[PDB]
Coordinates of C-alpha atoms and ligand atoms in Angstrom, one line a residue:
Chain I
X1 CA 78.2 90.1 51.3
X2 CA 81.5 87.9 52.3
X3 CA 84.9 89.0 52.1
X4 CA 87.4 87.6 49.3
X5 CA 88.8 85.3 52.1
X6 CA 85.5 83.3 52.4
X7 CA 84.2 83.7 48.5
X8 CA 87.5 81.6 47.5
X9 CA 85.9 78.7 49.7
X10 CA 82.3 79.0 48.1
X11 CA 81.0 75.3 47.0
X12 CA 81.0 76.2 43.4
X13 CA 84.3 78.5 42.9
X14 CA 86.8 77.8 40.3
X15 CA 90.0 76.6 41.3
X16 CA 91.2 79.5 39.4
X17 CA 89.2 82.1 40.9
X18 CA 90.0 80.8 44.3
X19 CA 93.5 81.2 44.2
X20 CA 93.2 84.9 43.2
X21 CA 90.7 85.4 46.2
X22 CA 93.1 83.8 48.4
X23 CA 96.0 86.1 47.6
X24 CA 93.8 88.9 47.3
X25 CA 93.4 88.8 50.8
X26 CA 96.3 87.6 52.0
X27 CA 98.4 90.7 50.4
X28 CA 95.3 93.5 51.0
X29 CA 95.1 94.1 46.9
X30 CA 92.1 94.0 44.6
X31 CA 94.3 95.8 42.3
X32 CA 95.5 94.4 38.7
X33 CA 98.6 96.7 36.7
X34 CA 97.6 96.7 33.1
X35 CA 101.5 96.4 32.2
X36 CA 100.9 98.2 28.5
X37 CA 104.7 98.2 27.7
X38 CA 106.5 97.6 24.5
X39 CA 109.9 96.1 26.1
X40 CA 110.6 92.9 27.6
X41 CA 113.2 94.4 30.2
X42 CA 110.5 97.3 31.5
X43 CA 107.5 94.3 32.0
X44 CA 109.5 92.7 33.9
X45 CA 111.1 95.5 36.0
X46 CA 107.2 96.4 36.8
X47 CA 106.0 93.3 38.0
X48 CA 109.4 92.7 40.2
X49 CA 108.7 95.9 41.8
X50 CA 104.9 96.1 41.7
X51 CA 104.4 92.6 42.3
X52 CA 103.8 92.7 46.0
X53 CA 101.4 95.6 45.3
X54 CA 99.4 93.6 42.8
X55 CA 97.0 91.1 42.9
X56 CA 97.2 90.2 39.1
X57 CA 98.9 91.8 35.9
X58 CA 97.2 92.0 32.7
X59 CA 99.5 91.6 29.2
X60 CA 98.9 92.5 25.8
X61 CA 101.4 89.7 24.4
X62 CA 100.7 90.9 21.2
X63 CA 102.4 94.8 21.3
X64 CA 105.8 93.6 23.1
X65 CA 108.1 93.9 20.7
X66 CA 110.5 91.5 22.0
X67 CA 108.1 88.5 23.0
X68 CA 109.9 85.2 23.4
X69 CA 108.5 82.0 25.8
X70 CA 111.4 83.2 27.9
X71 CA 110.2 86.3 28.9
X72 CA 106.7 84.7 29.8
X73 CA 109.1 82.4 32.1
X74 CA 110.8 84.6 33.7
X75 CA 107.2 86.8 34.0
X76 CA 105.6 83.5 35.9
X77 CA 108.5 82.9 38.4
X78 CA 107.7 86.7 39.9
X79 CA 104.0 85.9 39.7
X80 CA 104.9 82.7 41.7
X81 CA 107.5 84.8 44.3
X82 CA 105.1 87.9 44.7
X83 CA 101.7 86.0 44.3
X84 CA 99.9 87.3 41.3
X85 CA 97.8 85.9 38.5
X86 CA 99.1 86.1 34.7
X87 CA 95.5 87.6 32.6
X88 CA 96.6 87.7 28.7
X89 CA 93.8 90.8 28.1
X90 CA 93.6 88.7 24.5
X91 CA 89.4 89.5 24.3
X92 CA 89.0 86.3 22.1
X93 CA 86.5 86.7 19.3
X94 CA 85.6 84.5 16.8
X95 CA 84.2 81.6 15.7
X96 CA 85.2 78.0 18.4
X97 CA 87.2 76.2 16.0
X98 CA 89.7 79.3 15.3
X99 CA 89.9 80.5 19.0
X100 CA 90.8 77.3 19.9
X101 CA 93.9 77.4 17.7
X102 CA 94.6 81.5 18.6
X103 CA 94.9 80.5 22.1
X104 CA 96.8 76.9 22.0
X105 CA 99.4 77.7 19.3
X106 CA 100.3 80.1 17.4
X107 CA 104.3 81.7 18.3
X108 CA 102.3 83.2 21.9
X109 CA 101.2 79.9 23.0
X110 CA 98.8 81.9 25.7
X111 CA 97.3 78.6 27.1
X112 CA 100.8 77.6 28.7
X113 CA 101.3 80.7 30.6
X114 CA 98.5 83.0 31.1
X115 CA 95.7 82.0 34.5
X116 CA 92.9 84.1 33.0
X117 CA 92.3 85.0 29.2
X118 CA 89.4 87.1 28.1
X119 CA 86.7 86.7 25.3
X120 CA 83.6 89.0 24.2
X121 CA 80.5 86.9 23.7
X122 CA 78.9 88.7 21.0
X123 CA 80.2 85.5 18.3
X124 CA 77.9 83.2 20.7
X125 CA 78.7 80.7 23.1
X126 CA 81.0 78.9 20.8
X127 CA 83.9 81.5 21.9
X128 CA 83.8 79.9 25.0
X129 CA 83.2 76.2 23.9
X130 CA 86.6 76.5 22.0
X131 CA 88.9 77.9 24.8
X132 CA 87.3 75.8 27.3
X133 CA 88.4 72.7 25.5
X134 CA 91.8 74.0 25.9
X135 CA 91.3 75.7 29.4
X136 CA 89.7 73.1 31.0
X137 CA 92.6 70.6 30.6
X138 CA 95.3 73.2 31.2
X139 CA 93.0 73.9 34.4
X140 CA 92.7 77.7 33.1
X141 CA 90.3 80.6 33.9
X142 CA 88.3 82.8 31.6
X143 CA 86.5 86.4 31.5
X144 CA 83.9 87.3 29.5
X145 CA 83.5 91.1 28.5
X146 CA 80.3 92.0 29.7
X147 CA 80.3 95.7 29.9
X148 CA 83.4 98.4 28.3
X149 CA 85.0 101.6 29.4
X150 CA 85.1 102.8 25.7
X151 CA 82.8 105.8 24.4
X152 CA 80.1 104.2 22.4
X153 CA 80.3 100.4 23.9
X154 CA 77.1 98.7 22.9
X155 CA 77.9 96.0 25.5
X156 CA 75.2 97.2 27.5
X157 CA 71.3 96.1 28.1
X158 CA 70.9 92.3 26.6
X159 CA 74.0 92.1 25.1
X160 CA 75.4 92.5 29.5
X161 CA 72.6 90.1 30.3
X162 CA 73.7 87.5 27.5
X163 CA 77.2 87.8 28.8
X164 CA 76.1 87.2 32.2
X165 CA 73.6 83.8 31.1
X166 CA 76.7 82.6 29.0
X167 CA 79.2 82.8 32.1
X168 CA 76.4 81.2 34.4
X169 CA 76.4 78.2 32.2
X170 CA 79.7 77.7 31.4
X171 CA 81.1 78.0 35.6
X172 CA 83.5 75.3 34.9
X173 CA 85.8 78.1 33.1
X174 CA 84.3 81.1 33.3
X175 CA 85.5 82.8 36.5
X176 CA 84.4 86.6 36.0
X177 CA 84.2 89.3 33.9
X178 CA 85.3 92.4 32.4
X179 CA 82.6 95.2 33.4
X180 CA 82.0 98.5 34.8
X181 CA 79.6 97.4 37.9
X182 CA 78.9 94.2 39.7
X183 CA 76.5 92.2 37.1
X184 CA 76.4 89.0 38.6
X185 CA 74.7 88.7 41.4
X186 CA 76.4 84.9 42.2
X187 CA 79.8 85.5 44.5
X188 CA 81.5 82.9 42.9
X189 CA 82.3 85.4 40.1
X190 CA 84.8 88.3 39.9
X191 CA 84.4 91.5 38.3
X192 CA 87.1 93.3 37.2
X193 CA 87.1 97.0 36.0
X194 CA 89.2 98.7 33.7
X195 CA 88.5 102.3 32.7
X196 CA 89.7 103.4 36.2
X197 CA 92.0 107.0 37.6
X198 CA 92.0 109.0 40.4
X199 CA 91.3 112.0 38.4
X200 CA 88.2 112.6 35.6
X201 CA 89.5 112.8 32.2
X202 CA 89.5 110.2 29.3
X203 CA 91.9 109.6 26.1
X204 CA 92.0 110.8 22.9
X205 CA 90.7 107.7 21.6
X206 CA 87.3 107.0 23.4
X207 CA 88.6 105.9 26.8
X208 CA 86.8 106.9 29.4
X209 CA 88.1 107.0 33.4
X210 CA 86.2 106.2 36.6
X211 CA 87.9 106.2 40.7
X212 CA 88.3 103.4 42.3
X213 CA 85.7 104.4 44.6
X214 CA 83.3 104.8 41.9
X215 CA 83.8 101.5 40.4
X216 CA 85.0 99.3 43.9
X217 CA 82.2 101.5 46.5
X218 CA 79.4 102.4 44.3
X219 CA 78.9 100.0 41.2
X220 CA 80.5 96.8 43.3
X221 CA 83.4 95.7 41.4
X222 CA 85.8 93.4 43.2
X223 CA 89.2 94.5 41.1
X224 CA 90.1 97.9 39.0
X225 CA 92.2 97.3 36.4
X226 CA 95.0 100.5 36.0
X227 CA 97.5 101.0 33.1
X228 CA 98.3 105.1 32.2
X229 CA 97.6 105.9 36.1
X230 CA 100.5 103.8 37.0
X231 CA 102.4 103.1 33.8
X232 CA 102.8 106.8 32.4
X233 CA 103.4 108.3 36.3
X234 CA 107.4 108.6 37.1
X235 CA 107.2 106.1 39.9
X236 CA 105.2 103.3 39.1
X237 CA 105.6 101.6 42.7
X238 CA 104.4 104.6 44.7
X239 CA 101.4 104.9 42.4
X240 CA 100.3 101.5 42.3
X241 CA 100.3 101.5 46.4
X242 CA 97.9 104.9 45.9
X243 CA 95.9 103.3 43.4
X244 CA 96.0 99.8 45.8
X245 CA 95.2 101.5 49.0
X246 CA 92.3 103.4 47.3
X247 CA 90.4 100.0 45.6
X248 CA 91.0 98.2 48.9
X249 CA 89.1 101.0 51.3
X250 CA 86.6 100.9 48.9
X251 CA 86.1 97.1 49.0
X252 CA 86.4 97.4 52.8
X253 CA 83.9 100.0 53.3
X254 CA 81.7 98.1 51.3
X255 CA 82.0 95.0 53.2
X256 CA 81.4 97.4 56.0
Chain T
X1 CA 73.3 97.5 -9.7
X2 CA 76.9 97.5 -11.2
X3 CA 79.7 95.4 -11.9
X4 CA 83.1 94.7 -10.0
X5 CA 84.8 96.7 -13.0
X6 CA 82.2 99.7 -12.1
X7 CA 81.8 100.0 -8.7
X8 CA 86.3 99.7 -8.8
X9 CA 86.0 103.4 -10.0
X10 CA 82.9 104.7 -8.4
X11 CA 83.8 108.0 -6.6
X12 CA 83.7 107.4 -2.9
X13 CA 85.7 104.1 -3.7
X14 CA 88.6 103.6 -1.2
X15 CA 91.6 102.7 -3.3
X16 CA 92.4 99.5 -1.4
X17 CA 88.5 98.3 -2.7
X18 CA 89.3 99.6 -6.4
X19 CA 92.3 97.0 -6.8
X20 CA 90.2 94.4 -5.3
X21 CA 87.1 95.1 -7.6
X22 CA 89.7 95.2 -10.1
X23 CA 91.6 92.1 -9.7
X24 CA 88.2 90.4 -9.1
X25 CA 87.4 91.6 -12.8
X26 CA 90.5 90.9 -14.2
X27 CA 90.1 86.7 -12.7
X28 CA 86.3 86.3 -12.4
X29 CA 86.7 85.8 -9.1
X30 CA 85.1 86.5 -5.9
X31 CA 86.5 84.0 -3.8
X32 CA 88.9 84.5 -0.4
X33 CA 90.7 81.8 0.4
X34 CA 90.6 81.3 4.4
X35 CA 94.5 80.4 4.9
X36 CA 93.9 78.7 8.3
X37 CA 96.7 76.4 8.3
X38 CA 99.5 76.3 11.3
X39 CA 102.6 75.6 9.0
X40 CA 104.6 78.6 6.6
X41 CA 105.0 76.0 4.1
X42 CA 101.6 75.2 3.5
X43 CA 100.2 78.4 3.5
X44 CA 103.1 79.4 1.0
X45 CA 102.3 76.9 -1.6
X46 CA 98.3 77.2 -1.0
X47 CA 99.5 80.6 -1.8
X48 CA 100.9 79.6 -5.0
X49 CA 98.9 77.2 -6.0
X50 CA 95.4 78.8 -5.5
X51 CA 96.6 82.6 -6.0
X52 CA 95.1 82.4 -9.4
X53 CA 92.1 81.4 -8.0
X54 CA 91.3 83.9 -5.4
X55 CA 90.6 87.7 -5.4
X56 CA 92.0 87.5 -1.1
X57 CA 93.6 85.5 1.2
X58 CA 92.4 85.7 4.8
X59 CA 95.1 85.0 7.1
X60 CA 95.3 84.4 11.2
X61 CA 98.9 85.1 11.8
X62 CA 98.3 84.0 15.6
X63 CA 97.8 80.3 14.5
X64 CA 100.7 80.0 12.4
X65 CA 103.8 78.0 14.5
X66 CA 106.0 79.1 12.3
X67 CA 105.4 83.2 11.7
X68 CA 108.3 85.1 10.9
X69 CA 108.4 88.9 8.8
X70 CA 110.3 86.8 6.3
X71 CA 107.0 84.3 5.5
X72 CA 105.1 87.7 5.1
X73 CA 108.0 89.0 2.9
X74 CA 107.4 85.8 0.3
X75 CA 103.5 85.4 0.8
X76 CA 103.0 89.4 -0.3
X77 CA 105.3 88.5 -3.1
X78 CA 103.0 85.3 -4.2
X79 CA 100.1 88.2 -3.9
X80 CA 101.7 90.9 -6.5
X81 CA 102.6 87.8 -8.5
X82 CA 98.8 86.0 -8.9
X83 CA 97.4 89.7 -8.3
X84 CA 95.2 88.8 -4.8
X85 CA 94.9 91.3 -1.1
X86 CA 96.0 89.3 2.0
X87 CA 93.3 90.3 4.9
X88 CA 94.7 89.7 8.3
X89 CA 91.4 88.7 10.3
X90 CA 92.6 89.3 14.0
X91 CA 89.3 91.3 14.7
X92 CA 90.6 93.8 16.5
X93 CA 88.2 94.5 19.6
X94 CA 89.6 96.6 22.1
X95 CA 89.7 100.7 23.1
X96 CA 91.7 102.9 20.4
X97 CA 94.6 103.2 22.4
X98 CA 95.4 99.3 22.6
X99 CA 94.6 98.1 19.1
X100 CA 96.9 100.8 17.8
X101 CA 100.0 99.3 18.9
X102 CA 98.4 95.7 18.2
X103 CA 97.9 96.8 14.4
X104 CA 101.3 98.6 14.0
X105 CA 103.7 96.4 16.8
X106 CA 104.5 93.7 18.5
X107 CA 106.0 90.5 16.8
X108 CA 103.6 90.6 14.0
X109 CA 103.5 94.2 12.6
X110 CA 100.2 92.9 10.9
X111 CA 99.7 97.1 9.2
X112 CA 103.3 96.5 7.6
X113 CA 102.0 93.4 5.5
X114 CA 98.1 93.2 5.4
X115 CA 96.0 95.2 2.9
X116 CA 93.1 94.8 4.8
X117 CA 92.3 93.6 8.5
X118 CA 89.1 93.8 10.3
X119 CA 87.5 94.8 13.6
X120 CA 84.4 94.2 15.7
X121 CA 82.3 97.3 16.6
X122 CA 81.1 96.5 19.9
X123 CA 83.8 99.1 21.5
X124 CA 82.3 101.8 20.0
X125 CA 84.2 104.1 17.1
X126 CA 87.3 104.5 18.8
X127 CA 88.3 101.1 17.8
X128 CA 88.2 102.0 14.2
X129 CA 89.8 105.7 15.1
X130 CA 92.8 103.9 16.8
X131 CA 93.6 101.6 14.0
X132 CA 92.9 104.5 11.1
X133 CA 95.8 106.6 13.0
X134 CA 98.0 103.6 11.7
X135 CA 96.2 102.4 9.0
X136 CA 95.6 105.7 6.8
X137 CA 99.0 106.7 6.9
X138 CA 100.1 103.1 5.6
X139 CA 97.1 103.1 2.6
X140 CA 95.2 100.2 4.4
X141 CA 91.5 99.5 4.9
X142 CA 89.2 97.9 7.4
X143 CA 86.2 95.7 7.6
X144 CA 83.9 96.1 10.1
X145 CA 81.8 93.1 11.5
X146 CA 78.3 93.9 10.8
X147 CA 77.1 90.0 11.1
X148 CA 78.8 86.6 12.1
X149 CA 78.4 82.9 10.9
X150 CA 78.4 81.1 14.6
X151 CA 75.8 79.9 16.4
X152 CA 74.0 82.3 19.3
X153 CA 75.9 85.0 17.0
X154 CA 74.6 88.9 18.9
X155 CA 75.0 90.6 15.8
X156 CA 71.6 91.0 14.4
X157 CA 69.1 93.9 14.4
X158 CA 70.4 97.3 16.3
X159 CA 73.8 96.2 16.6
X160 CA 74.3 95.7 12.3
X161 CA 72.9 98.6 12.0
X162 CA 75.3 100.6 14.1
X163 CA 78.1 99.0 12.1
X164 CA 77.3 100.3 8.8
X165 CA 76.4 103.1 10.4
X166 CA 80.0 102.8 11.8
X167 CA 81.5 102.0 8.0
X168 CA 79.7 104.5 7.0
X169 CA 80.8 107.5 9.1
X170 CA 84.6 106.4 8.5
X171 CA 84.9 105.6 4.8
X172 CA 88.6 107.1 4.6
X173 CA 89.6 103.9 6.2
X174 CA 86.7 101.5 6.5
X175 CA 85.9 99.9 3.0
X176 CA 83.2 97.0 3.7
X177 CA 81.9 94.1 5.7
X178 CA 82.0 91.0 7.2
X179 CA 78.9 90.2 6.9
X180 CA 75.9 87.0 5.9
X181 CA 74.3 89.6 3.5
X182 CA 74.2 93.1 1.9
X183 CA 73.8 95.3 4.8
X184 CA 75.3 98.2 2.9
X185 CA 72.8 100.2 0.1
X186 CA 76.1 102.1 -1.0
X187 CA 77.9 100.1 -3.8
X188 CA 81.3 101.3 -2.9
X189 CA 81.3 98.9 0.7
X190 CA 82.6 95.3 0.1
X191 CA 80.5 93.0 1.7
X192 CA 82.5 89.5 2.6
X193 CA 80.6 86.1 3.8
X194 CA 82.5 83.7 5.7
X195 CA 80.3 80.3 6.7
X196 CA 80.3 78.8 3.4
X197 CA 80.5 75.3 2.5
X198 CA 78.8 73.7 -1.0
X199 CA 77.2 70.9 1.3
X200 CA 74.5 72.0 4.3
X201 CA 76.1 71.5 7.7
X202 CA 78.4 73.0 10.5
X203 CA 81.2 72.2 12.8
X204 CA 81.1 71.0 16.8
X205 CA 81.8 74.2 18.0
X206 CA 78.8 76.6 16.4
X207 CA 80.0 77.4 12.8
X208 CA 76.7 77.5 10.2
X209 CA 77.1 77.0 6.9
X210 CA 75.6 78.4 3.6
X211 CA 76.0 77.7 0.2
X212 CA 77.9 80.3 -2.5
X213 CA 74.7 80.7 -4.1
X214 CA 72.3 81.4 -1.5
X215 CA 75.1 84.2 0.3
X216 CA 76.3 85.5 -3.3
X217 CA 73.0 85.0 -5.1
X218 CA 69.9 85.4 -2.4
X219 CA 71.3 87.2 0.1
X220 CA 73.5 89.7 -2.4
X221 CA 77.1 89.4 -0.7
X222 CA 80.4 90.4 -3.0
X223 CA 83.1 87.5 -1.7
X224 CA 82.5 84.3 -0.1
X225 CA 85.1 83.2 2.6
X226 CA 86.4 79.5 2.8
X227 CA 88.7 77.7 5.0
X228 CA 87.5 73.9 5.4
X229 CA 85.7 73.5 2.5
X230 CA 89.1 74.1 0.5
X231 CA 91.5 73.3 2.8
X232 CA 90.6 70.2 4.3
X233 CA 89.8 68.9 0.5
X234 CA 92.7 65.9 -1.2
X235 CA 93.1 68.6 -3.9
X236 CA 92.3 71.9 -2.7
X237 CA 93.4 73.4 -6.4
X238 CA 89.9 72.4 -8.0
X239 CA 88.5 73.0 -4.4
X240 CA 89.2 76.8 -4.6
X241 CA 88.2 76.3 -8.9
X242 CA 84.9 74.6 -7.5
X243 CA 83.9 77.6 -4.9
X244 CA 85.0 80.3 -7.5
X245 CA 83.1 79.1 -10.1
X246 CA 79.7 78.9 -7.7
X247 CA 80.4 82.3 -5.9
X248 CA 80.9 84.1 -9.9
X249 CA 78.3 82.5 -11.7
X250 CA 75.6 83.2 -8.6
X251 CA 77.3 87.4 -9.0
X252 CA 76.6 87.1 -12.7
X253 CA 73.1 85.9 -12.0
X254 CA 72.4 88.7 -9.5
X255 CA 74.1 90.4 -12.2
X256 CA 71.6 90.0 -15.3
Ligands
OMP301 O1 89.9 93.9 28.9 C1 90.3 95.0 29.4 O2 91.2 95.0 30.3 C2 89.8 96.3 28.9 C3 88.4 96.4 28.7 C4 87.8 97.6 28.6 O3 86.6 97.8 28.6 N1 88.6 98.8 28.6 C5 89.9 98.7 28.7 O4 90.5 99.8 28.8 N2 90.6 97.5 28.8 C6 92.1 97.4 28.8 O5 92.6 97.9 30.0 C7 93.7 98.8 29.8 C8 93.3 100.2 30.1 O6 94.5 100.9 30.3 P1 94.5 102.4 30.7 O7 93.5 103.3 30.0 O8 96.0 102.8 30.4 O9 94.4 102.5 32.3 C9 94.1 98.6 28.4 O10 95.1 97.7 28.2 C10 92.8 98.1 27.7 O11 93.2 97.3 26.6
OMP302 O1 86.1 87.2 10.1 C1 85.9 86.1 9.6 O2 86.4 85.7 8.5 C2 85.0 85.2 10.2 C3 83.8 85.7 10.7 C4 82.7 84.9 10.9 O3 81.5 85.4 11.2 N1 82.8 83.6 10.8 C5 83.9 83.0 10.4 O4 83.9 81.8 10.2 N2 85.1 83.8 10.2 C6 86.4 83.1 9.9 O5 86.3 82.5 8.6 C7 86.9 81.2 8.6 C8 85.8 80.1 8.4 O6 86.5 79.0 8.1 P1 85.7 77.6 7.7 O7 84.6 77.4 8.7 O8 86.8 76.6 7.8 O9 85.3 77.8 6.3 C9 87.6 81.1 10.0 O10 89.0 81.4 9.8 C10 86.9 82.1 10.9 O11 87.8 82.6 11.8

């Protein structure tokens, strides 16, 4: 097993992917903020503040209310001061032609600022043959969703190996996945894993919760996504460090 | 079997499906038009021009340059005028707490326009619970993705299965299919087949296509979906006249 530092100089890493392995070790985070905010104003007050703490932040473009370009602007100069990648958590899902368009154009224009998008590969590999034709030339990173936190996922079995097969063969602009565990077993691939608290519980609406020792120690993830845990706690900068501090031990003492 | 007209007042009929089996009726027609066009203007006078035409039109508000409420204010008023449902096809994909606000918020407020949208089941139920909380309260329905068109497509055996059973279990809300087939023996779930084209073939990045008579008429589907094969036509007026007339005459047929 090699630490983050030497995985982002493997022979076959995406440029992409090495970046984020660079950073990750240079500011001790394997931590992404799932910033799930409405307002303009508050996304950007939490990746100012949390920035340093982070190692990525994850948008849903498509629930803030007051979206312009600008804001995305003004999101990538404190990615570029604290040192964190842009993930649009977009889960791309249909036929090449139109995800092509979805992620190009459209009033988001996703491709222009976001490092890392997301797809599911249950439409086949065209999903990823129609971002990567935008990706590629924009030199951009995807995910594929390989396994979910949600109660009654059927991303699991052939439909995790499938995933995995389609990211294998399409290393060029695939750089990881959504999952629970470690799936790959090739170290030029991230896993990041959402679904993650300190504390057991769930949601009302079929979201289930892991620690970051669970997900980071035990099923060897690499990153633990974390909205609620941070987002809905009344500091947001002392909780990310908690929830940074615990995914980071965990990596370590898996690294031994 | 039963007629449009019939199955429009059978009574577990969701009252979104009863004024599409209505309109459908009314026009002899069982074609949606597949809007996928990146200017306000041309999906406006497509609007106006085909309404008559088609029982839907399918929208992707993400690839449109141009969105504003105000577009959606004037294409829902060429809707009541030529009598046809506009189905937002974002294929919502994600845990019940994020495609709540993604239905209801953002930019697009796609619940406050669209009569129908639609949503993959890989998530498990919660993805269908999340957008129902909206969604019922605003007299919408939902289609479920039971089967896709693309090539490599993981939506066969098992997993269709658990999507009707899905439809099925949530029929307050959830009122049919996308779908290549019938995958539904209950009469009051619209199934709607996207791929279709008159002439064999497919596109670069894995779309299949079948003909009006072999998803309609073999395979026992309710709508036939068509972007390309209208809207890339020089006259896409007798385009949309040429796919309606195959996708009602192959229904009749099935008909007797
Ligand atoms: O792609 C994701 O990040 C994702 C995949 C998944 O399996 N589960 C999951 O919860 N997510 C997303 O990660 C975030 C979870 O947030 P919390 O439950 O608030 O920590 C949400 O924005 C989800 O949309
Ligand atoms: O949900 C859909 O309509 C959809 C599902 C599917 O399995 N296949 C599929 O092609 N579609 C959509 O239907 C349209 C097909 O367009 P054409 O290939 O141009 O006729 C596109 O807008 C796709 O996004």
């Amino acid at each position: 097993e090699l630490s983050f530092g030497a995985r982002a100089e493997l022979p076959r890493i995406h440029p992409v992917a090495s970046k984020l392995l660079r950073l990750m070790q240079k500011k001790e985070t394997n931590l992404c903020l799932s910033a799930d905010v409405s307002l303009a104003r508050e996304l950007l007050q939490l990746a100012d503040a949390l920035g340093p703490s982070i190692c990525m932040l994850k948008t849903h473009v498509d629930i803030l209310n007051d979206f312009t370009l600008d804001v995305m602007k003004e999101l990538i100069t404190l990615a570029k001061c604290h040192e964190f990648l842009i993930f649009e958590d977009r889960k791309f899902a249909d036929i090449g032609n139109t995800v092509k368009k979805q992620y190009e154009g459209g009033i988001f224009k996703i491709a222009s600022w976001a490092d890392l998008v997301n797809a599911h590969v249950v439409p086949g590999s065209g999903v990823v043959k129609g971002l990567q034709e935008v990706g590629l030339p924009l030199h951009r990173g995807c995910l594929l969703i390989a396994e979910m936190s949600s109660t009654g996922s059927l991303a699991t079995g052939d439909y995790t190996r499938a995933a995995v097969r389609m990211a294998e063969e399409h290393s060029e602009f695939v750089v990881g996945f959504i999952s629970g565990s470690r799936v790959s077993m090739k170290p030029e691939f991230l896993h990041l894993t959402p679904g993650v608290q300190l504390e057991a519980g769930g949601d009302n609406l079929g979201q289930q919760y892991n620690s970051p020792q669970e997900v980071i120690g035990k099923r060897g993830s690499d990153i633990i996504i974390v909205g609620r845990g941070i987002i809905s706690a009344a500091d947001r900068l002392e909780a990310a460090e908690m929830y940074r501090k615990a995914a980071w031990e965990a990596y370590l003492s898996r690294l031994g």
